[PDB]
């Protein structure tokens, strides 16, 4: 085996995490620098990134400390929303200050307990600074617009951002808590609209309906089933052998065409005119369905169907031999619409209630995917604001305030961890220096004055560093919720500490 000894393990732990750290720190905060990721080792391309998820996963980890952090932060992004950039940058900034400590010669446990007690002080001070702005529900709507506005910007979107502020706030608000990929289902397609997204009333499905199957169904009763034939159905009188010589290769193919007709009669028995199967068949099998008069709609989504099922009292579940096994969903018309310039089969009959479907229109697939991830993190933050409608002023204003409170306690409270409580405070303030020079303000000057102001009780004024200026955060709206920040702080301190604890790495 390989043994990487006591100094050296800690050095690998610091540089590795610093390098990955510097990738997500540019996008983080107000507009400053971005990442444009350079791909050559998998494939030769350039990629336009702004989400921390893309940046961190796509570049491997081959430095053992680096692995742990990218995994903890990725899961935090799903739950918390915006945990990808936030957790990784702070964890990296803390290791830098460990580097200092250790050469000086402070033991790793002093550092670990100093950072930890200092996290407890930060959390207590974040609670202090956070105050309600959801005490009337219409005032609550507005609080949510600010929080939403902040996430969305400093992620490249052309005009899809402007819709999404209002969108996310509507979706979360009505539902109350929980997930919100059930209260707004994200269908992504290209349209003639360059970067516009709207609320569909119904579920609409991409695929042209050709042939003898008619494009307008009137009086739909939908039979929901999640499985079906891929293109051929096997059954009791479906199983045969017809292939064993070279001419017999075409005869079995004949036979498979026949197996398609057998599946049609299965639905015909039910008498349910709209059958949904989740998989696509080909154009040739489609003629059989349309002829019989029990129409097959293929390439269906689970998410769309789920939208209809909730309003009508249907059930989304497989098994069909009769329609009494699986409850029915309803729509009036399933009519071929053209939206954009792409021809769509559109289910219309019910609107809203427990779910909407949102149809995004771009011209690049990259825009849709990018848009979903921005939006996603937002919906998660807004989910948490329903529970705790406190909100705390940021932009880097929060991070200095907690740091001031941690510096005060850093002098008084401990017996040896003083140096380490301060190091924790200085690492929160590292994030507001980096963004200052991108903005065109002096890093040193920013961190040293306003920090005393906002702490004394001018919590409103904070860091507007997309212009390099002091602005009101209640009026400019660079304020995020209490919850999202509390949890990424927790996460980042733990993650650094885990790899700070490591004094030998053995590789076997």
């Amino acid at each position: 085996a390989d043994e990487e000894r006591a100094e050296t393990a800690r050095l690998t732990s610091f540089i590795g995490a610093i390098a990955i750290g510097d990738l997500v720190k540019s996008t983080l905060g107000p507009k400053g620098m971005d990442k444009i990721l350079l791909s050559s080792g998998r494939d030769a391309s350039l990629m336009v990134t702004n989400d921390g998820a893309t940046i961190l996963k796509n570049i491997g980890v081959d430095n053992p400390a680096a692995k742990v952090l990218v995994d903890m932060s990725r899961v935090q992004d799903d739950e918390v929303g915006d945990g990808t950039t936030s957790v990784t940058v702070l964890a990296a900034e803390l290791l830098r200050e460990a580097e200092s400590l250790i050469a000086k010669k402070i033991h790793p446990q002093t550092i670990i307990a100093g950072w930890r007690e200092a996290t407890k002080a930060a959390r207590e001070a974040l609670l202090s600074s956070a105050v309600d702005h959801g005490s009337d529900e219409v005032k609550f709507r507005q609080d949510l617009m600010n929080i939403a506005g902040t996430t969305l910007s400093s992620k490249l979107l052309t005009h899809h951002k402007d819709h999404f502020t209002k969108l996310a706030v509507e979706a979360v608000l009505r539902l109350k808590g929980s997930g919100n990929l059930e209260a707004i289902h994200i269908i992504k397609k290209l349209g003639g609209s360059l970067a516009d997204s709207y609320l569909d009333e119904g579920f609409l499905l991409d695929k042209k309906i050709g042939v003898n199957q008619p494009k307008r169904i009137e009086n739909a009763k939908i039979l929901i089933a999640n499985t079906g034939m891929d293109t051929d159905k096997i059954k009791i009188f479906g199983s045969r052998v017809r292939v064993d010589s070279t001419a017999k290769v075409a005869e079995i193919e004949h036979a498979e065409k026949e197996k398609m007709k057998e599946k049609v009669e299965r639905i015909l028995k039910h008498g349910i005119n709209c059958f949904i199967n989740r998989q696509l068949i080909y154009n040739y099998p489609e003629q059989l369905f349309g002829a019989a008069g029990v129409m097959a709609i293929e390439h269906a989504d689970f998410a769309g169907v789920e939208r209809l099922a909730l309003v009508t009292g249907g059930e989304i579940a497989s098994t069909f031999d009769h329609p009494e096994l699986v409850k029915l969903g309803s729509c009036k018309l399933i009519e071929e619409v053209m939206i954009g310039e792409d021809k769509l089969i559109h289910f219309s009959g019910v609107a809203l209630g427990e779910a909407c479907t949102i149809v995004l229109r771009g011209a690049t697939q990259q825009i849709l995917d990018e848009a979903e991830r921005s939006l996603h993190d937002a919906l998660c933050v807004l989910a948490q604001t329903v529970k705790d409608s406190r909100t705390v002023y940021g932009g880097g204003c929060s991070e200095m305030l907690m740091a001031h409170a941690v510096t005060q306690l850093a002098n008084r409270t401990p017996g040896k961890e003083a140096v380490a409580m301060e190091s924790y405070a200085k690492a929160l303030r590292m994030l507001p220096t980096i963004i200052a020079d991108n903005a065109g303000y002096d890093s040193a000057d920013l961190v040293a004055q306003l920090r005393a102001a906002h702490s004394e009780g001018n919590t409103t004024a904070g860091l507007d560093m997309r212009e390099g200026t002091i602005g009101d955060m209640a009026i400019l709206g660079i304020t995020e919720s209490f919850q999202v920040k509390r949890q990424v702080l927790l996460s980042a301190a733990e993650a650094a500490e885990v790899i700070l604890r490591v004094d030998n790495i053995i590789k076997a």
């Binding site: 390098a19 400053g32 990442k35 004949h254 040739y284």
Partner: protein, 513 residues
């Protein structure tokens, strides 16, 4: 760390150095390339535009140059080499400012502010020609033809272009008209004289034999089905193990198809166009000869382009199997023409098609494969120049002469702007003046003297005159037949400003594993 400083300096060095080599543009300059490849093949190149699209690089910063040219073609279709060279100017700006201690995020910001002001000043100097008026369109089209290879086939080509774009057009100054509606087909045979503008939709395909419908009345066929016949998709109980038994199966197979094609004709079909990808063999190779007999057109293994145009313009939708009879969701039509012309060429024209009020097709003809190529490039640029006016109108100086002109007007606006951003933009004004200079420099020997001189002659003429870049001599450049569309130079600035800005933005090494 040290990863952000060194990457920015090299990437900027590495694009810029290639952009120095590449800047030999306009007229006869530099020395030819016969190229021994990294794979051992002999390749010969000429023309700046054709090279840049083709260019095969693996340096992330240099790839930006390849793709910059392609976007330009799609919006303008003019200025494809131009947009790269001026982008290399912006890179020249970026180094000098790093030494001064102006941070990289700041240099990005300034590009936007350079763009916003610059394009407004381009619109100011420009003389606003109408985009629906033929006379001015006709002059402008001559400008682009006479700057390309043609000088005698130019006569034929100017008027066809004004007519073609007129068919697709929309009255506004907003973005309309595309080469997703202007369909460009080649045909062996005819001459540059005989090139034909059909206002409807004509598709490029190959049709078996000569002896087929060249008359009016057609139901246009968009099918996605394979036949049912013995040893196709219908049952046979005759299993072959002999040449004789093989002969029987094929005879009865082809026979039933001779019946089938009559039901296809019953529909009104005189055009049928088969899907791209089989569902077994599609309509069999036997079916195609039988179809030819009914007087009905073929193409199996159809190109991608045709499938997109048919459905969109004519509303043509897939139809059911023939034994089950066709569904009749096919569009309207009235012409099935197999275009033969001077003994060669196979083509489909569809006239009396439904339209959305767009979609023209020009047929490009030439008696020899090179002679088609000569029509083709020249027309492309002439269609595109008139196109650029609908999307956004007006005429400014051409050859990239207003980027030199723009430099004088623009320095003034930076000084009075009096920002952080002012210094970045002022330095770019001086860099746009290098473009005729740098072009010449590389060719020969004795560089310095000529280089300073071309900037004097253009500058001194003032805000309305300078040196021309297609005739030389200090004379009025704003209207004199050295013009290009507003769209070409504003588009070029815009594309450049985005791609370059991106190099500044990165920090630290990045390489996916």
């Amino acid at each position: 760390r040290d990863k952000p400083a060194q990457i920015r300096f090299s990437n900027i060095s590495a694009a810029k150095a290639v952009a120095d080599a590449i800047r030999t543009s306009l007229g006869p300059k530099g020395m030819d390339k016969m190229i021994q490849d990294g794979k051992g093949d002999v390749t010969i190149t000429n023309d700046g535009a054709t090279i840049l699209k083709q260019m095969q690089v693996l340096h992330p910063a240099a790839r930006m140059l390849v793709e910059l040219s392609k976007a330009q073609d799609i919006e303008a279709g003019d200025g494809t080499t131009s947009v790269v060279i001026i982008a290399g100017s912006l890179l020249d700006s970026c180094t000098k400012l790093l030494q001064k201690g102006i941070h990289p995020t700041i240099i990005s910001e300034s590009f936007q502010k350079a763009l916003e002001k610059g394009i407004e000043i381009l619109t100011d100097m420009s003389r606003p020609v109408e985009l629906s008026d033929r006379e001015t369109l006709l002059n402008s089209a001559t400008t682009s033809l006479n700057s390309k290879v043609v000088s005698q086939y130019s006569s034929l080509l100017s008027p066809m272009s004004v007519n073609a774009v007129m068919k697709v057009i929309d009255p506004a100054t907003a973005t309309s008209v595309d080469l997703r509606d202007i369909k460009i087909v080649k045909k062996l045979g005819g001459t540059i004289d005989d090139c034909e503008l059909v206002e409807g939709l004509v598709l490029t395909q190959k049709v078996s034999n000569s002896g087929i419908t060249r008359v009016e009345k057609a139901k246009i066929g968009l099918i996605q089905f394979c036949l049912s016949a013995p040893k196709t998709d219908m049952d046979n109980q005759i299993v072959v193990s002999d040449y004789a038994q093989m002969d029987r199966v094929l005879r009865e197979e082809r026979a039933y198809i001779l019946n089938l094609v009559k039901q296809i004709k019953k529909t009104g079909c005189n055009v049928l166009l088969i899907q791209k990808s089989i569902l077994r063999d599609a309509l069999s190779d036997l079916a195609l000869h039988f179809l030819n007999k009914m007087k009905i057109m073929v193409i199996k293994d159809i190109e991608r382009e045709d499938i997109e145009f048919i459905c969109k313009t004519i509303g043509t939708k897939p139809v059911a199997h023939i034994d089950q009879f066709t569904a009749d969701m096919l569009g309207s039509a009235e012409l099935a023409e197999e275009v033969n012309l001077n003994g060669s060429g196979k083509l489909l024209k569809i006239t009396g098609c439904a339209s959305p009020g767009k979609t023209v097709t020009i047929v490009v003809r030439g008696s020899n494969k090179l002679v088609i190529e000569e029509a083709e490039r020249s027309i492309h640029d002439a269609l595109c120049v008139i196109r650029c006016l609908v999307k956004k109108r007006a005429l400014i100086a051409g050859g990239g002469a207003p980027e030199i002109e723009l430099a004088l007007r623009l320095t003034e606006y930076s000084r009075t702007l009096s920002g952080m951003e002012s210094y970045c933009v002022r330095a770019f004004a001086d860099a746009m003046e290098v473009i005729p200079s740098t072009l010449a420099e590389n060719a020969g020997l004795n560089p310095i003297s000529t280089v300073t001189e071309l900037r004097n002659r253009h500058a001194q003429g003032e805000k309305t005159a300078g040196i021309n870049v297609r005739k030389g001599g200090i004379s009025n450049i704003l209207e004199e037949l050295v013009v290009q569309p507003l769209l070409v130079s504003v588009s070029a600035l815009t594309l450049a400003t985005e791609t370059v800005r991106s190099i500044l933005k990165i920090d630290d090494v990045v390489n996916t594993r």
